Amino acid sequence: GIVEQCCTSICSLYQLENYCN
Amino acid sequence: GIVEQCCTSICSLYQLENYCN
Amino acid sequence: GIVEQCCTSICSLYQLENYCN
Amino acid sequence: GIVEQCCTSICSLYQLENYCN
Amino acid sequence: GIVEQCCTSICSLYQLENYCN
Amino acid sequence: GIVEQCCTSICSLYQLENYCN
Amino acid sequence: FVNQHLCGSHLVEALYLVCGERGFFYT
Amino acid sequence: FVNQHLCGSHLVEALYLVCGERGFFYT
Amino acid sequence: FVNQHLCGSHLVEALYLVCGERGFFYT
Amino acid sequence: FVNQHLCGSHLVEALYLVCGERGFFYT
Amino acid sequence: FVNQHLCGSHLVEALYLVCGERGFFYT
Amino acid sequence: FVNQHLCGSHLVEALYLVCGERGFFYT
Ligand SMILES: [Zn+2]
């Protein structure tokens, strides 16, 4: 979940690249 | 500056970081 | 106002439409 | 996609809602 | 309206405040 | 900086303009 | 359009989306 | 909703408002 | 406020910022 | 950039900045 | 506008509305 | 260029998102 990897826990912007379509 | 780099043309995330204090 | 109706209380499409001119 | 429907052209709420989960 | 004054043309802070409550 | 002046203290129009380049 | 609490800028954006150029009042 | 173009982050904001906690797919 | 044009969401956002609690009438 | 967890509309903002018109799933 | 504390995004948006393409240092 | 130009308020928002309270230079 993007929320666990980014809201519940700290994530970097580069990590979001894996969530693009 | 960052305007000409990101608005006029297209820039990347690292170019933005170049303008952080 | 609309803030009391939509922020403090629960908002809805119908409520938003009522504040249009 | 949604950008062709809503940005290039004009879309309705119904169309927009089609992209909700 | 405000659109004609601030979008179609360039308005000043004073003009923009004309629409505050 | 402006953050300390406007966020920690109060600043008006002519205070923000002082920070424009 | 889901029912929910809409506050601040989001409420302002919601009114613009719904009303558009009809214009609207925010209070 | 109204009759206007929704582009860039404005379109993403529209999706965020209309879909709420259900989420959405920007595709 | 100054020089540039303000349309759509940006105009309503500028109104929200400038007027604040007082509210405003987008018309 | 060394930001901590992104939540709500802030996470959505970050997704659009990185993904752009590639699209993304917000669920 | 309204004499009150301006923080975060509120402050960044206020400086852009006031300074515009004149530029500014947000520190 | 799946990623579009960042101008005006959108460029300032992106800078704040990336730089944070530490600050940035809009020039
Ligand atoms: Zn815009």
Side-chain angles (χ1 to χ4, degrees):
Chain A
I2 197 171
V3 179
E4 292 85 62
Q5 180 173 170
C6 286
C7 172
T8 300
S9 175
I10 175 178
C11 82
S12 75
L13 293 187
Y14 285 155
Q15 272 183 59
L16 299 176
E17 293 185 358
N18 297 111
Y19 283 85
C20 302
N21 195 54
Chain B
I2 194 64
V3 175
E4 235 205 317
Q5 286 178 49
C6 296
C7 177
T8 301
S9 54
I10 294 282
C11 71
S12 53
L13 283 185
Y14 77 87
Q15 299 196 67
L16 285 172
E17 242 223 293
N18 266 305
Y19 282 78
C20 291
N21 169 225
Chain C
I2 186 65
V3 37
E4 185 107 26
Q5 280 172 280
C6 277
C7 173
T8 300
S9 295
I10 294 182
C11 202
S12 80
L13 178 56
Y14 173 65
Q15 240 145 2
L16 292 168
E17 291 175 357
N18 273 62
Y19 277 76
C20 303
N21 190 218
Chain D
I2 193 60
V3 329
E4 283 72 27
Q5 297 179 38
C6 298
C7 173
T8 300
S9 309
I10 288 74
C11 67
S12 65
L13 180 55
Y14 185 89
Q15 283 175 73
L16 200 55
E17 282 161 334
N18 209 193
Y19 289 83
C20 292
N21 187 213
Chain E
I2 183 162
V3 171
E4 288 69 51
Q5 300 188 343
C6 302
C7 173
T8 303
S9 299
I10 296 166
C11 70
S12 63
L13 176 67
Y14 182 82
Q15 297 182 80
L16 192 62
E17 296 170 315
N18 273 154
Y19 299 83
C20 289
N21 278 315
Chain F
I2 186 70
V3 173
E4 182 167 44
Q5 189 201 54
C6 294
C7 176
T8 301
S9 182
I10 273 70
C11 84
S12 79
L13 198 62
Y14 312 102
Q15 216 117 71
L16 293 175
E17 244 162 53
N18 285 174
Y19 286 81
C20 299
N21 289 324
Chain G
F1 205 108
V2 304
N3 304 295
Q4 60 185 313
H5 286 93
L6 285 177
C7 305
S9 285
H10 291 311
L11 176 51
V12 164
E13 293 290 339
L15 283 162
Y16 186 52
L17 175 70
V18 169
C19 301
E21 298 316 336
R22 293 179 176 71
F24 64 81
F25 324 77
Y26 176 81
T27 70
Chain H
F1 66 87
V2 74
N3 182 243
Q4 283 298 315
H5 285 113
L6 288 176
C7 301
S9 53
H10 301 294
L11 176 54
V12 176
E13 166 70 5
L15 257 7
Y16 177 65
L17 295 173
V18 61
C19 307
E21 59 180 355
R22 301 171 65 73
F24 57 83
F25 344 109
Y26 179 68
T27 46
Chain I
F1 172 43
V2 291
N3 321 305
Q4 200 98 239
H5 289 75
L6 287 174
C7 307
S9 163
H10 298 282
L11 179 56
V12 297
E13 280 299 326
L15 232 17
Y16 178 54
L17 185 55
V18 169
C19 305
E21 79 293 355
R22 313 186 58 69
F24 57 89
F25 41 85
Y26 180 70
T27 29
Chain J
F1 176 81
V2 203
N3 227 61
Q4 8 71 70
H5 6 312
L6 303 149
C7 309
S9 62
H10 290 289
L11 173 58
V12 174
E13 287 171 47
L15 274 167
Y16 182 65
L17 183 57
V18 47
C19 295
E21 270 58 62
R22 289 183 178 74
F24 59 84
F25 282 40
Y26 181 58
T27 57
Chain K
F1 348 80
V2 197
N3 333 275
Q4 213 156 305
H5 296 123
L6 279 179
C7 307
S9 285
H10 309 299
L11 182 55
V12 306
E13 296 286 349
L15 280 162
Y16 183 63
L17 186 60
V18 173
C19 300
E21 308 312 341
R22 283 224 288 156
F24 60 82
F25 302 143
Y26 181 84
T27 61
Chain L
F1 79 110
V2 54
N3 310 80
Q4 185 56 56
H5 302 358
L6 280 180
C7 307
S9 68
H10 297 304
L11 178 53
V12 167
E13 284 167 24
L15 230 26
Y16 184 50
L17 197 166
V18 171
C19 303
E21 288 293 84
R22 79 168 99 178
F24 56 88
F25 310 100
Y26 186 63
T27 176

